[PDB]
């Protein structure tokens, strides 16, 4: 196993952990604030997916500070992971193209 495929795999498992912990921590911080809709785990898990994937949507979002900090973590972990996979596809393509040129 290379590096760009170990990291791509590791980032996926790390992202799932961010999605799950983000769902749990979102409900923890959103409950107590009036009007908050991010207060059940199943839909928070759906929100964390919307959030990590940056679809966002708008049916769910945090209204508390610590809920919005949890958001920031979920977004960055999502953008970085899906970007680390792209960077891994480039190394795979740049690599196999060197083999197509002999070198």
């Amino acid at each position: 196993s290379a590096l760009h495929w170990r990291a791509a795999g590791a980032a996926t498992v790390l992202l799932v952990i961010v999605l799950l912990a983000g769902s749990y921590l979102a409900v923890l911080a959103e409950r107590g604030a009036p009007g908050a809709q991010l207060i059940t785990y199943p839909r928070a898990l759906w929100w964390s997916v919307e959030t990590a994937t940056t679809v966002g949507x708008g049916d769910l979002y945090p209204v508390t500070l610590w809920g919005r900090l949890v958001a920031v973590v979920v977004v960055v972990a999502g953008i970085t992971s899906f970007g680390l996979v792209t960077a891994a596809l480039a190394t795979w393509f740049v690599g196999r193209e060197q083999e197509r040129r002999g070198h």
Partner: antibody
Amino acid sequence: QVQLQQPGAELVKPGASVKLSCKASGYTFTSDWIHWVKQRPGHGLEWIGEIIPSYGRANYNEKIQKKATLTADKSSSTAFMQLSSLTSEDSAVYYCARERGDGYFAVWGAGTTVTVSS
Amino acid sequence: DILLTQSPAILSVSPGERVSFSCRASQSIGTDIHWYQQRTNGSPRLLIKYASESISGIPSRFSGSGSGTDFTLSINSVESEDIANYYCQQSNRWPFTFGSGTKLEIKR
């Protein structure tokens, strides 16, 4: 088996305090929220607050004069509601309910009749 | 906060006849409504969750309907055991709020 177990009754002198219990059994997850509901005789159900025992954070009904303080001993699977400075207005039945973090109260306790009298 | 209005508060119906309770939320709450039954001196018991999803142990004559703001709990063929108070409860926005309650009354 009985999941949420509450005492029968408590007699509280006016202005005194009382610590109601709610021992749990059955599947206890980390997503368990324990709620407390107040029902005056003849009246409806009134949400008081919620507690997450796997962390210890408690939220309370913003619309009422806060008369409760929710705790939880994670080792004994027991949620406690500490009422204090009670009047006859606080004399009612107090249920505890278990929420699986998904909105509904899956199970309730038998409730504890709290009588504030001399 | 979301207000759960239950009108009428009392509902008369003949035995074996179909009944329907009404729960209205002050704003749209999707399907995040739940129904509870409370007989005399008994604890509330969950009848219907998420407007229409049923519970095991609750008879099949208990059904639910509605979305957004208008929700309905219906009983096909009312029985004497159905005599109780019926509350609705929303979990769309915090805090959770209850309905005022509707008393079922059989005319035998």
